[PDB]
Amino acid sequence: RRALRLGVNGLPNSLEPVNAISNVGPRIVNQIFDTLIARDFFAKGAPGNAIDLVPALAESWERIDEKSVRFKLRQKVMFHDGVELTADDVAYTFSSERLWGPEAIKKIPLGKSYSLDFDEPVVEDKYTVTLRTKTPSYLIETFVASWMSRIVPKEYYKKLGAVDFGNKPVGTGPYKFVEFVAGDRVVLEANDAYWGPKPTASKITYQIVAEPATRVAGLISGEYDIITTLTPDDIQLINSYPDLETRGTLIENFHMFTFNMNQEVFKDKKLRRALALAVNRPIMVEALWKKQASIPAGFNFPNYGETFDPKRKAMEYNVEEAKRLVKESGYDGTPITYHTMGNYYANAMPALMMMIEMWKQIGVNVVMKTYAPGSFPPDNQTWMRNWSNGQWMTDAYATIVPEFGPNGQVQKRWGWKAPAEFNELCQKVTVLPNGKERFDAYNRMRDIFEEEAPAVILYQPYDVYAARKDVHWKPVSFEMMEFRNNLSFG
Ligand SMILES: O=P(O)(O)O[C@@H]1[C@@H](O)[C@H](O)[C@@H](CO)O[C@@H]1O
What we know:
This is ABC transporter substrate-binding protein. The chain is an alpha+beta fold.
């Protein structure tokens, strides 16, 4: 078997699966671990975007009532160290201790905020576990198929602790941990004792190549088999090589910019809204994305299913109103920093430079401030920054509630003083089953989100990879790389 060499935009600071949640962690942690339920992106000849859910670590499951789901586990699955997976490991994964309780916040900072209102799991037998919520939740199934739900080994994880575990992970996945050189590379090797499809690569390397031009040259020189996070501008040249090709797809994520609302200039919604109203998304999508990116109608995406609003109007663009808001605001002309980690996000700097021009036309002076990985300054030294949100559930709950909700980081850390009505609606949508009331509540939340502008949605990126034609692998419609029944050579 051939070793797979990947040229990547960045790496997570931990391989602990919840802590690894980002654009860069899942492509690694998806290899090391498994979930109870998994998504088959290639079902019924779909081009890596199928919504179909299939058994994975759980052979079957059944919803018992409004707050519990019973899982029948696959038997004789082994973790990479030979330990057998049991309901004990699954209960530990979803426990107060490890994940959502007061004692978990120090280890998994976003565990509680991103989790459901969990009750302790119930182990019925070695291969049967019930996952429950304290209050009604119809989101258990989608949560369990998500990146929040990779199953960790209880004894090994408790032995090392979440920090050391993140540096030496043990999972049930098709690839096992070899090395992690902080801010440089991750090496994984084939897990030949895997319960599912046998791994097709002997090894996988994720080498950070921060600069996309250098990443592109690395594939050209034969240093890499697949490279990530390219832009539509790289397409024509890469495809000019008979041996190389680009592979891309729209993904279930949106790029955005957001604010440090603890800062005086951003405490009020006025300048936040003025900056949002001056963002000409069609020109950015045309110029930087070659029309391949998509512009959603608010915090509203098709993967939400029953809570997607297909009749929703496009987000407003109004330069004259934006000019009036700047004039009425307390803004003096003082430069406002916008923190970006080079091109961690595809088109980060070209998108920012276009917006700086749009903002200059409305009377706002925005200045780019570059930071290297691990050098994001203290919160109070930041004003604007770019970010992204992966839409990780088959429901509108994510990411508006975990990120922007009353218990979330945009309010708690970043100082968004959300209107009381917004927080009231977040609590309602959490417990309600699908219906008119829940549907309408999400629309009112979308309306408040656009009015308040705690963040400004740019677009869904067209995720561009490039690969050698002799490396058969298809991208999926999510911020990760799938190799199960999707990697072969020659
Ligand atoms: O944009 P990033 O690469 O920094 O990572 C974000 C997370 O921070 C976020 O938790 C998640 C869900 O909304 O979406 C992304 O994965």
